[PDB]
Design a protein around this ligand. Sequence first.
Ligand SMILES: [Mg+2]
Ligand SMILES: [Mg+2]
Ligand SMILES: [Mg+2]
Ligand SMILES: [Mg+2]
Ligand SMILES: [Mg+2]
Ligand SMILES: [Mg+2]
Ligand SMILES: [Mg+2]
Ligand SMILES: [Mg+2]
Ligand SMILES: [Mg+2]
Ligand SMILES: [Mg+2]
Ligand SMILES: [Mg+2]
Ligand SMILES: [Zn+2]
Lengths: 152, 308, 148, 108, 166, 287, 59
Amino acid sequence: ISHGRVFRRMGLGPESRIHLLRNLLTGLVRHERIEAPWARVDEMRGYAEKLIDYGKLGDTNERAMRMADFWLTEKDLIPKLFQVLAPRYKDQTGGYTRMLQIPNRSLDRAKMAVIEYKGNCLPPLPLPRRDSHLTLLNQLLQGLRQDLRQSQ
Amino acid sequence: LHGKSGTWWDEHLSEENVPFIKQLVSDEDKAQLASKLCPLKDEPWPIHPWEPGSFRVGLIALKLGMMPLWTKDGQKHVVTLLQVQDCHVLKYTSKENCNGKMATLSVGGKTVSRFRKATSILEFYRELGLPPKQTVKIFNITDNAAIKPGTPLYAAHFRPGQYVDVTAKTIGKGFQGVMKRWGFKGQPATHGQTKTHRRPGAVATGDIGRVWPGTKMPGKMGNIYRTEYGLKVWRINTKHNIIYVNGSVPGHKNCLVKVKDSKLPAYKDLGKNLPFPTYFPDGDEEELPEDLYDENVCQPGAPSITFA
Amino acid sequence: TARGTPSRFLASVLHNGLGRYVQQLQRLSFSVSRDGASSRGAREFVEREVIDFARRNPGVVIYVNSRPCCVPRVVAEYLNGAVREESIHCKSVEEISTLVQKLADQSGLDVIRIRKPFHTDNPSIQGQWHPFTNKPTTFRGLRPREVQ
Amino acid sequence: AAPKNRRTIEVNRCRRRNPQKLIKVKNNIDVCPECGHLKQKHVLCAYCYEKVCKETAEIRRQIGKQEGGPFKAPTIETVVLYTGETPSEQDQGKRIIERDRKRPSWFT
Amino acid sequence: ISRKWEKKNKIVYPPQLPGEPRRPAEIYHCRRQIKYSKDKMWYLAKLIRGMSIDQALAQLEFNDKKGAKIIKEVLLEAQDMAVRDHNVEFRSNLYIAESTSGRGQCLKRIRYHGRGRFGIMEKVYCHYFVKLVEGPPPPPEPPKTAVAHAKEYIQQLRSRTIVHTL
Amino acid sequence: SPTELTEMRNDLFNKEKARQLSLTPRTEKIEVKHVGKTDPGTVFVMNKNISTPYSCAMHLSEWYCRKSILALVDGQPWDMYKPLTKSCEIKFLTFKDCDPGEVNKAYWRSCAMMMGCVIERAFKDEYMVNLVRAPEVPVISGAFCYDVVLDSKLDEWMPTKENLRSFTKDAHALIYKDLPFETLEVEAKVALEIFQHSKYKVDFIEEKASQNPERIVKLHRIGDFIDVSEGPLIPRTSICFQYEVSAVHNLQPTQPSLIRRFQGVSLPVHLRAHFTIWDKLLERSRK
Amino acid sequence: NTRHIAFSGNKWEQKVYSSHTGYPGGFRQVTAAQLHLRDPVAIVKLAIYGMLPKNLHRR
RNA sequence: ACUGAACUCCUCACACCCAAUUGGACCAAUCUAUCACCCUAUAGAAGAACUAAUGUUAGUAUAAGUAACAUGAAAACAUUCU
Ligand SMILES: [Mg+2]
Ligand SMILES: [Mg+2]
Ligand SMILES: [Mg+2]
Ligand SMILES: [Mg+2]
Ligand SMILES: [Mg+2]
Ligand SMILES: [Mg+2]
Ligand SMILES: [Mg+2]
Ligand SMILES: [Mg+2]
Ligand SMILES: [Mg+2]
Ligand SMILES: [Mg+2]
Ligand SMILES: [Mg+2]
Ligand SMILES: [Zn+2]
C-alpha cells in the first residue's frame, strides 16, 4: 500500500535518491536543459522550482545560501543561481521549469524527459501548439462566442 | 492512420476557445443546477403522508472527514461528516421492472465533467436536464415515497436522532497477504523458521485432494462495497448540507457514500417525524436553523457542561 | 475406418437400370511385357482369354499395348469418366480373368463406404410423416385454452 | 516443482497468442504538421528534437570554448548570435555565443 | 536450408488480356539470420499483418522491441524494390499480405550452472518474411451479426435429414 | 419523372466525360513540383488530364492522401479529384493548416451539396422539389445553407424533429456510402442542356458563365446527383463525420415563391467535436 | 398449474432435495414441501431434469 | 408382455480371437548368379525388418521467452559530480 506516498524510491535508498536528484539539479542549473529518465525528471522538477524560490530569497539569506550549497555540487553555479536564474524569474511566481516527454532512450527503451529552465538561451524545444483558431471547429466556436456575447 | 484515434474535448480547440468552452459549459452546469432549486413549483409528484412500512429515498453524500463530538453525559463520540453535494433524483422505476417487488429511485450526486462521460450517459443527463453525476445508486422505496426525477436532495432530508445505514467502497489495499487480509497468525520469527513467516499454513486437508471454494487466501483486499448499519445522525449542518454520522464510514475521504434510513428492526418505524418524501426547502414551512442538533449533543458555545 | 475415409450414397450412373442396362465399363487397356516373368500370366491371358472376353463384351474396347511402363497393368475406363488401374503383376491367368470380369461388372463409382444399402428418390407414397399427421383437428382451428 | 506433462502446441498457442500477449496497435501516432514527420501525440517529434539537440550541442561547444575550464559558469546572461546578427539593446551586458551558421528558421 | 522466398520474386506471369482485371503486384522480401528469437519476432509480424505499408511503418517506428527496427528496415527495402523492380506506381499503395518469422540457423553455447553442471544456451537467430501486395489493405472481416447467426442456424435446421431410414 | 431526369443528367454527364477524355488522348507527361513545406522539391511526372492531386498525394504517402483535402495548383484551389492540365506547382491543403480558409469553404460547399441531394431524394413523388441554390455562407455563420422551393401543396408544412432526424439519417447514409466528388469544367451549353428543366439552375449557370471570361461552368456529382458549385469540393463524403440537418427557415419574400432554406452543420473526421460542444453547435446552427 | 401438483404417499414430507453451494457448510437439504413453497416450479423442473438423458443436449 | 450377447437361426463367406512354447504358410529391403534389361522373376546368400533396454549419437520440443544476468549521474563526451 502506498496511499499518499508522494516520493519515488530511487537509487540505492533515501540518501542515494537525494544525491541522484542533486546531480540532476546541478546539471539542470549548469546547462539549463537536461535529458533524463522521465521519472527522475518528474521527481527533480519540484526541487528545481524550490531552488529557484530559495534563490529568490536572496544571496544574503543564510538559509538560502546553505540550501544552495547543499543542492549545487559545483559551487560556481551558486552565484549563477543567485544572480542569473532568480533574477530571471523575479517577476514570475512559479512554473520556472518546462518538462516534455522525449522519444524513448535507445539504450534501454526508458521513458525519457527533457527539462529546461524557462527563458534559457538555448534553441527552443518543439513545443506542442494548439490548433489554429482558423480551423473549422474553432471558427464555429468563435461564431458561438460572438452570438452568445451579442445575445447575453 | 487506421481511424481509431482517441480524441478528447481539448484536442482540436484553440488557445482562445479553450477558456471560452470551459466557462460556457460551467455556466450551463450551474444554470441547470439552479433551475432545479424549486421542485415544488415544477409540477411535483403527489406528496403522500407517511404510513407504517413506507421506505423513503436516501442520499449520496461525500465523506468529508471525522471529528470529535461530546454528549451531555460526558462521553466522546467520533463522528464522520458526509456532505451532500449536488444530489438529485435521476430516475424512477416501478416494482415490476425494479428487479424485485419495490419501486426504485436512482439518485446521483457529485456533478462531474461532461467531457469525460460516455455518450449514452451524456444523453441521459441531457434528457434529464442536469449535469452528470459521479455515482448513481438505486434506492428501494414504496410508491408512497416516489419523487419526480430532477428534484434535489439535501442533508436535512435526515434529522438528528435518526439512525442511518452508510454503504461505500472500502479503502482498497491491493493484493494483500493472508496475515493482513484475514488476520492469520503466521509463523514464529526465529527458532529455525526459514522463508515462512507470513505464509498460510495448510490450506485444506489431504483427503479432499483440493481446496474448498471460499478458502481464505492472499488476494485483493478492500475496494468492495460494505455497509455500516445503525449509525446515529448526531447533527445536521443545513447551510453546508453536512450530516454528522456516528462512528466510522467505509471508504476514504472525499469518497461518495450511499446514505439511507437504517434497516435495523429496532429502527423500523422511526420515520414518522422524518420528512417523508424528502425535505423540501422550497416548501419554506419553517426555515431550518444553520445546525440541527441531537438532544444529547454538547453543542459548542453552550456553557461548559457541569455534571450537577 | 469410416471416419477416416470418404463416403457416398448408393447410386447408379445414368439411372442405369430404368430403361436399359448399359455396361459402364467402356475401355480396357492391358500393358503387357513380351519378356519378364511378372507378365507371364498377362501373356497367357492375352493368348487364351482376351478374345473370348472381347466378344462377350462388345461394348468394351480392349487395347493390348505389349510394352508397359513399370509393372504390367490393366487400366479400366468407365463411362462416367472413372479410371481404375489394376496391376496384373505376377497374377495367374484365372486371377486376371476374375479381376477383368470384376472390372467389367462394376460401375465407375468410387469403391468407398456406402452410407445406405438402398436409394429411393420416392421414399414415401402416402406422404412423409410430419407432426400433424395423426393429429386430429378441432372446430374453428381453436388451439388449446383458446377462449373463442 | 517439475512439470508433470509436456504442454502441447495447441495449449501453448492458446496461451501465447492471447490478446493480452499480442502487441497493441497504437492510435496516438500522427504527422507533425511542421515537418511532416511521424510523432506520438504527447511526445516530441523525434526529427525536430534531434535538430534542436544538434544545434544545442554546437552552442554548448562554443560555450565551452568561451569559458575555457571547469567551474567557470558566468554570473551573467547568455545570448546566441548567428552570422549577420548584432547584439541588441537588450542583449547588452550578456555574453555572446557566436555561431558560424545562419539563424535557423525554427530558432527565434 | 531453403531459399524459396527469394525465388518467389522471379516468377513471370504471361501477359494479361485487355479484357482482364489488372493483376496486383506482389513483392517478396526477407531478412535472414536476425539475432532475435522467432517467438519474439512473431508478435511484430502478427501486428503488422494486413496493414498498409505506411501504417505498418508508423506502428513499427514507435515500438520498443528490437525486432521492430529490423522489420521496418525490411519493409523499407521491400517498398524500394517494389517501386524500382516490380513496377509499383505508388510507394504507399502497398499492404502487408504476409508477414511471418521463421527459425534461423542457431548456435549452441554452454551456460555454466552452480555445481559443476551446465546448460546448453542457444544463440537464437530468426528469419523474417514479407509479401507486399499492391493496393489498399483489404477491409477487416465484419463481425457476425445476429441476422447472419440466425440465418446460419436456420440453414442448419433445414439441412436435417431423417437419418438411418429409407 | 425524377428518375428520368436523373438518368438523362447522368447520361449527359458521362457523355461529356467520355468526350473530354477522348479529346485528351495519349499520355502527355506534365511535371508537377511539390511546393509545400514538407517533402519540398519532389517532382511528380504525372499524366496530363488523367492524373490528379490525389495521385500526387498517393505518390507522396498515405498520410497526404488522408489529410489532404484541397490542392493549391499554382496558387489556385483544386479539387483532389480534378485532373491536372499542365506542368505546375502543387501544395496540399488540410483542415489543420495555419489558415485553412479555402478548405473550410470547400467543406461547407460540399456539405451543402450533400444536403441538397438529401432534400431532392427525401420527399414523396407527389410533391415537387426544386433546388434553387446553395448560398455561400461563412463558416462563422454557424451553418451551411441550401435554398429549395417545395411543392405548393407544402406551402404551409414545416418539417418536424422526426423529419429533420430522417434528413440527417439520409445524409449519414450518403456518408457511409462514401461517394467521391466527381468534377467537370464544362461548357455553359452542356450545363444548360443538363439542367434545362430547372429554371433556377439554368439562370445560376448563366450567372456563372457570365462571371467566367469563357463559358466554363463547374459541375459536381456525388452519385446520380449533379449540381452547380461555387468552387472546389472535398474529395469524398466520408470526410464528413458529424452531420446534422439542423432546421428549415422560410425566407421573408414568400409572395413570389416559398424559398425554404435548409440549415445544417457538420464537422469532418479530422475535427470531431465532443458531444456537448456538438450539441451547442447544433443549437447555434438551428438559427 | 405446477403449484398444484400432487405427491403420492408422504413424499411431500419425506422427499428431500439436496444441494451444495460448494462452500464448506454449504450442504442444504430441503423437503419437497419446503422446496415447493420456495419455488412452485422446482419440483416438476427437477423431475424432468432427472428424467432427461445425461448428455449435453439436456439443457 | 417386451427388451436383451460375438448363443442360435437367417443371406453370403470361412484358416482368419489364449501367455510361455511349438508347427506351418507367406514376406520387405539388400547383395550375388542368371534374367528382366521398366524398376521384375527363379534361386543362392546375409551386419536381412524396432511404438519400448532411466539404450547410443544427432535434431528439435516442453518447462519458457520462464529462472537468471547486466550499465552510478549530467554533459561541450573536454569534463564535472555522487
Ligand atoms: Mg531500483
Ligand atoms: Mg508473529
Ligand atoms: Mg527468515
Ligand atoms: Mg438381439
Ligand atoms: Mg457361433
Ligand atoms: Mg539387424
Ligand atoms: Mg526408429
Ligand atoms: Mg529408445
Ligand atoms: Mg520458448
Ligand atoms: Mg512459470
Ligand atoms: Mg526474475
Ligand atoms: Zn517534426
